[PDB]
Symmetry: C3
Subunit: 136 residues, 3 copies
Amino acid sequence: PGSMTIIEVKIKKLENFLGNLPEYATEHSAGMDLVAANEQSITIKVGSIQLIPTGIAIALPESFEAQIRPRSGLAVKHGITVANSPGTIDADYRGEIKVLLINLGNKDFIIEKGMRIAQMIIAKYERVLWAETSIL
Amino acid sequence: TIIEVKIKKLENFLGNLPEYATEHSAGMDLVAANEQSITIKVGSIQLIPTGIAIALPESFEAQIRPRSGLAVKHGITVANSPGTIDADYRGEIKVLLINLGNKDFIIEKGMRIAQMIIAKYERVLWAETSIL
Amino acid sequence: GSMTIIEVKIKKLENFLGNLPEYATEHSAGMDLVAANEQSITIKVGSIQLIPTGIAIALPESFEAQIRPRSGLAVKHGITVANSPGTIDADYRGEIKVLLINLGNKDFIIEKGMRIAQMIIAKYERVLWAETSIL
């Protein structure tokens, strides 16, 4: 394990947060595991959508975005996925990160605090300047 | 660093071209350009035109992603998310919406229906092997 | 005077057929992934089904492969990728499988050879958290 290129990102624990900040499973992971921080159990009925808090807020540096993506095993095993995927967190969004889950499986599913519910991948984006034309 | 992208208004476009909300925004809001109101009933999938076509430079893609508010409040999201626009796609950008909520929802022209984030992609050269 | 590429090791599994995933043109962002199920698979309306592709890859560090929906399949049949965008990184060396869901109006048969998803390779960044009380 040698040198590594990182981007430093400010993050705040809110009152409902427990445990560690979002972690990369390994040194080779593209995404950090987001963890449910709802104080009381949340049931997602078949077909229903529920917003799940994470208890963290971040301030991304300019030109970097955080993508909220589905955790694959949850979709494969329970049909649980991220209803607004991929979620876009940019430097403007400094409120609590919340994961919008939908139950597209065949059984009701309970979200409990501590459950891994989504992945967060940080990447660069570009800024477009439009050049309007009548011929493409 | 800013990238210039050619954009064409088609006959059905209105208002200003897709805009970044602020200097820190990752994406531009895509706006519905349907001439008549479109109802997306529960479970239905509907293609919404935007009235624009773009010509991306090589190595750049535009990603069509859901707007958070429509999904949180109405279960409306982008059915083929994220949509991939690249330098080959020079036709009209259309947003494929699905209603996974519990109430019918009307798409009106002028409504913000998706986000467009431009990013770089890398071109893969495969190295075939029997041993990973 | 060249284009920029990233070289990625790829292994064909026994069920793979045809050429390695291809870019449609020199200007394409993604490669077409092809169904590699040996027998037809029916995806009933509302059902979710994992479709194998017959490949495994070894991405270099800080590169990911995104598994994204193929637009025509969603527009015409309501078939899309249920865990989209799928994230393949350097740790995943198993067979790539596409998780499809049928949100259309008709049961749909996935046949071997069908294009079922797009694969776009991009860089990601590694976050170092800086914890603070004021954002």
